[PDB]
């Protein structure tokens, strides 16, 4: 599965897709062979920074006080202050809304207990448990990475699908992004990309094109 094959798949996925009145995203899909997904160690749940980003930036919320909140404000992010944590635990409807509206959460490390007690019941099952940072952290670099980040998640099945860009990006960009995703698999298993059984590219409402 070389770059030429990937470009061909992206190109055809783009061409086959019917026009729709929204900007469609590119999705990359892979099945795995000869990997025992019954062993938890073989499962993948890994963030990947896409070199050209997602198409539209991921939305990030920050749970923090003091200078963490200041930084979040300076970066234009949703801020959830310490007082709001208990409130959101009460108002789970609102918490669901906030969870849906964001792709990643960053949290002041010392707030993790409070977050687990009150918000984790909603965030955890959605895979949006916050990632902790030290209270003195400069979060700008992390935020910039997360804006371009997608998650590869197989759960317990030899399959994943992941966002790799949108149609306003170039084919070359989509392929770079797909390569970044594949590198996770390459690094994960002893024989790496040997374990790719079949791979596909599609636009949101277009057909899946096999690589
Ligand atoms: Cl990465
Ligand atoms: Cl969600
Ligand atoms: Cl291109």
Swiss-Prot record:
Entries under HAMAP family matching the protein: Ribosomal_uL1_A
Gene: rpl1
GO cellular component: large ribosomal subunit
Name of the protein this chain belongs to: Large ribosomal subunit protein uL1
CDD domains, sorted: Ribosomal_L1
Keyword Ribosomal protein tagged: yes
NCBIfam families assigned: PRK04203.1
Function: Probably involved in E site tRNA release. Binds directly to 23S rRNA.
Biological processes, Gene Ontology terms: regulation of translation; translation
One matching Pfam family: Ribosomal_L1
Alphabetically ordered keywords of this record: Repressor, Ribonucleoprotein, Ribosomal protein, RNA-binding, rRNA-binding, Translation regulation, tRNA-binding
Quaternary organization: Part of the 50S ribosomal subunit.
InterPro entries the record matches: Ribosomal_uL1, Ribosomal_uL1-like, Ribosomal_uL1/biogenesis, Ribosomal_uL1_3-a/b-sand, Ribosomal_uL1_arc, Ribosomal_uL1_CS
Annotated GO MF terms: rRNA binding; structural constituent of ribosome; tRNA binding
Family per record: Belongs to the universal ribosomal protein uL1 family.
